[PDB]
Paper text:
Herein we report the first X-ray crystal structures of mixed chirality α-helices in short peptides comprising only natural residues as the example of a stapled bicyclic and a linear membrane disruptive amphiphilic antimicrobial peptide (AMP) containing seven l- and four d-residues, as complexes of fucosylated analogs with the bacterial lectin LecB. The mixed chirality α-helices are superimposable onto the homochiral α-helices and form under similar conditions as shown by CD spectra and MD simulations but non-hemolytic and resistant to proteolysis. To get a direct insight into the structure of AMBP bp65/bp69 and their linear analogs ln65/ln69, we performed several crystallization studies using either the compounds themselves or their racemates to be crystallized as pure compounds, or their fucosylated derivatives of both mirror image peptides as complexes with the P. aeruginosa lectin LecB. While previous reports of similar mixed chirality AMPs concluded on either unordered conformations or helical conformations appearing in a membrane environment based on deconvolution of FTIR spectra, here we reported X-ray crystallographic evidence of short mixed chirality helices consisting of only natural residues existing as helix bundles within the protein environment of a lectin and almost perfectly superimposable with their parent homochiral α-helices. These direct observations unequivocally demonstrate that the α-helical fold with only natural residues can sometimes tolerate multiple stereochemical inversions without significant conformational changes.
Author numbering:
A (entry chain H), B (entry chain G), C (entry chain E), D (entry chain F), E (entry chain C), F (entry chain D), ...: 1 to 114
I (entry chain M), J (entry chain N), K (entry chain L), L (entry chain O), M (entry chain P), N (entry chain J), ...: 2 to 12
The structure:
Amino acid sequence: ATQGVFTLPANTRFGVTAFANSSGTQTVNVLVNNETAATFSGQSTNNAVIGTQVLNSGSSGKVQVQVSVNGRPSDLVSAQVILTNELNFALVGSEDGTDNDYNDAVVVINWPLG
Amino acid sequence: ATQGVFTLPANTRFGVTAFANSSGTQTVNVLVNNETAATFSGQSTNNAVIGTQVLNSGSSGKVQVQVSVNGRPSDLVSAQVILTNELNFALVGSEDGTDNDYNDAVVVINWPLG
Amino acid sequence: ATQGVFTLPANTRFGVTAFANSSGTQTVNVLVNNETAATFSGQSTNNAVIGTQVLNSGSSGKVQVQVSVNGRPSDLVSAQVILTNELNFALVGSEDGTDNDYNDAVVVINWPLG
Amino acid sequence: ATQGVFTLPANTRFGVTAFANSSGTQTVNVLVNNETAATFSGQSTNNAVIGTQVLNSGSSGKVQVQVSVNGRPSDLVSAQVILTNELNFALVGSEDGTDNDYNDAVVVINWPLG
Amino acid sequence: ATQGVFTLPANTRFGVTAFANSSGTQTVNVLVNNETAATFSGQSTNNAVIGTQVLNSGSSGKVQVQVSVNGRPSDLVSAQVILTNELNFALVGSEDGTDNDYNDAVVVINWPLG
Amino acid sequence: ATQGVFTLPANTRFGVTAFANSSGTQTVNVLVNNETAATFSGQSTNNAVIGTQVLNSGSSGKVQVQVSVNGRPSDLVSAQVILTNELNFALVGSEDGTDNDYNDAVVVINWPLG
Amino acid sequence: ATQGVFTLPANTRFGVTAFANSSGTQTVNVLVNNETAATFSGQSTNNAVIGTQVLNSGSSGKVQVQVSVNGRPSDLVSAQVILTNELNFALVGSEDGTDNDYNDAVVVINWPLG
Amino acid sequence: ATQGVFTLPANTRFGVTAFANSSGTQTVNVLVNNETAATFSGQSTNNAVIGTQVLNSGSSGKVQVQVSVNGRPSDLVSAQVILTNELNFALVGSEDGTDNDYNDAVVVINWPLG
Amino acid sequence: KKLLKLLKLLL
Amino acid sequence: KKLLKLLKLLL
Amino acid sequence: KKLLKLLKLLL
Amino acid sequence: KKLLKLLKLLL
Amino acid sequence: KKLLKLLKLLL
Amino acid sequence: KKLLKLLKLLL
Amino acid sequence: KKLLKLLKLLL
Amino acid sequence: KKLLKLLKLLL
Ligand SMILES: [Ca+2]
Ligand SMILES: [Ca+2]
Ligand SMILES: [Ca+2]
Ligand SMILES: [Ca+2]
Ligand SMILES: [Ca+2]
Ligand SMILES: [Ca+2]
Ligand SMILES: [Ca+2]
Ligand SMILES: [Ca+2]
Ligand SMILES: [Ca+2]
Ligand SMILES: [Ca+2]
Ligand SMILES: [Ca+2]
Ligand SMILES: [Ca+2]
Ligand SMILES: [Ca+2]
Ligand SMILES: [Ca+2]
Ligand SMILES: [Ca+2]
Ligand SMILES: [Ca+2]
């Protein structure tokens, strides 16, 4: 199944934050309406924040997270969870190798803000 | 029901990251072994990271997140989500007032690391 | 925080299924547009299905689950989870006593159908 | 990533329930310790329960859900969610065709029971 | 050894294509079941296609290529190559003179088609 | 293994001819020295020649055949065969779908010419 | 594409011979009608014959060559060539490493015998 | 056309292996640069290996195979096949009588080695 | 559990 | 409703 | 024949 | 923001 | 870690 | 060779 | 086989 | 090119 794609309410600010846990340098691309809106890159094996940003979901509300290492797409896992019918988390894990810890880049999208 | 309490595997490194979305200064306390293991404090209405750190889950794995604003405890909502039976997110929202956006301090715990 | 309330797309068919795990007879009420749309009652300590049915989410999409035992409201916990940006689960647990297993009535709402 | 595999606490009763939403006849296999422990089969486009059962996770705690339609494996999506650090849901959607509603067989695993 | 004879599956369509690389006019005769099925004639020193056609291998599958220049038979070389146990090439070269480039008429037979 | 790459004698004329056997429009790219030297495009289910051309293998002798359909690379199979130590055929088949007849574009390279 | 699979005439004796050119110990398995009919094992960097054997193609004529080193399947390349429409060679190369010489185990099948 | 002559890369090790399938004793002569480098002799109707050796192609790369039975040269068929532009087979069949099975001595040359 | 059921289990 | 398998069979 | 395309052209 | 509290104090 | 993956293969 | 690939990484 | 050529030599 | 027949006539 497709992973890393989320439909947000339109014209809504959201946070996006990426953590790294891998020897490989992670490149996280955040697309809004199928166009790159942010790119994070960094390397850490200790959960360092390689990027955090506030974006707007725009007219489509379509947000997609992609992860690559050395130009190779990582395998993604994702889900969205809603607490008390209002607080939203869109969650992404990614695997760049063979150990299947799926934490090599971890991306958390949260809304609403403010 | 109790919120903000999570049983992790014991003596395991985990990430904890707190975001702020409120006029009030947020104080996030993370308890391990029922003792304060980290405290984050900050103020943002733009989802700024007020703290991110690697902690150890300790001898029982019990991790508790508390949030307060000017000494008053915030009301918490939480859940844990597991992707591909491996990747763990422990999620906390909190409300310091009356609008019930539950984003005033947002806390994300993730494991495994590395 | 409020629990057991979910915003569905309006006028949309959804499944609702209730399971019982308690000595007490559980009464599950499902409200659509603040009015009772279905009521399930039964007793089981073996997770028996006490009701399953297709309902319609109504003009506002607002769906609320209530649980009571001996006329006393049970304490609720809830969340919504979305898989591959399309498959929705709205999940409720409830506690009628002191052991805090929160399974005394378990309610699962799922959509889309068909 | 692997989907439909869940590690439960050992020697623990759990419920497993399957709903069908497809023209195709759904076959749901539930494996415990890599051996078939239950099989449900049925057809419905209206979320009918094709099976519900109580199983024991056994010494390994490994539970795997498989879904097939006339022998062809369906594509699975899954996640586990934990409420108030105690109430567990292991959720599975499955797609047998091309429309990607992933509801063709919906499987819910819940624990604890009793 | 006999050259330019190939056993195809019976009653099967095949392509036959002839190229010319000689001062002399090439006459390529394609026999099926020992009877002429096609004759190509042309002159080129630039590998021009002097014939390309689809034929049927007939009741025995026996296909034979003969090449002559002004009535004199050319010396032939041939082989059949099968890729991934399914894609067949039957190859013929021919020499009408003394330089032994064996390209004076080059014939490629290929099957299956469609 | 890599397929569709051939080392020709350097600075040598060779013929390249492509046949189509598919519902999809075939695009054949012929690279010499890692730069496109010819592109053929056409559609046939009857082995029509979609391109034939004379090229020079250049200083390196490296010739590569690529096949795509609607921008998607086809799976290639290839080999080279030499008759009487002089007459060379470089052979390519390609599969654009699922039936594995590997004839969807068939490419034959031959040398020497003249 | 599938490699190392050949359709022989039914009920026909054939030879199969394997050569080794690698630091790794090669295990060559020859299947007839999908059942192991011969296994060769040995180590050489000088093209030593690690096995030669006469087999019968049986009623199916299906012969498959597999190669592994320390339990890891090698990548195969293969083709069949027919000389004077009667003498058959089924050829296999295999690569157990990164230099892509594809000679690590070389397997030659020839028929007819006698 | 000349058969059994092959141009190898210079100064390259190659394997040469001969099999016998005839009532007659086969004599295989392998010439490098027009000088005998190996001679095999034997008799088998069961595809026995009558010789296998490693030779060097020398500065000229010219290799020639000749087959005689009771002093009478056999009729030869031959071809060279290259897989993944790297693995080379030079193949010879020979006929010492009238049945034209061309297997009476079968010679396989392969390179590279090592 | 009701006290009667608890007493059945305990006793 | 396996319309792709139906199309394959009919066309 | 690429029936995925025809089918979506369908519906 | 506690603006409601402020307005209640002021008015 | 590329280095570690090959070390595990070797040892 | 087993080890010459490791050596290539280290060197 | 040598039978036929023996027979031709002989007869 | 086949010249010998014609060249023979020349002579
Ligand atoms: Ca990893
Ligand atoms: Ca990792
Ligand atoms: Ca608030
Ligand atoms: Ca807020
Ligand atoms: Ca309870
Ligand atoms: Ca209970
Ligand atoms: Ca579906
Ligand atoms: Ca469906
Ligand atoms: Ca010529
Ligand atoms: Ca010529
Ligand atoms: Ca095809
Ligand atoms: Ca085709
Ligand atoms: Ca190798
Ligand atoms: Ca090797
Ligand atoms: Ca013979
Ligand atoms: Ca013989």
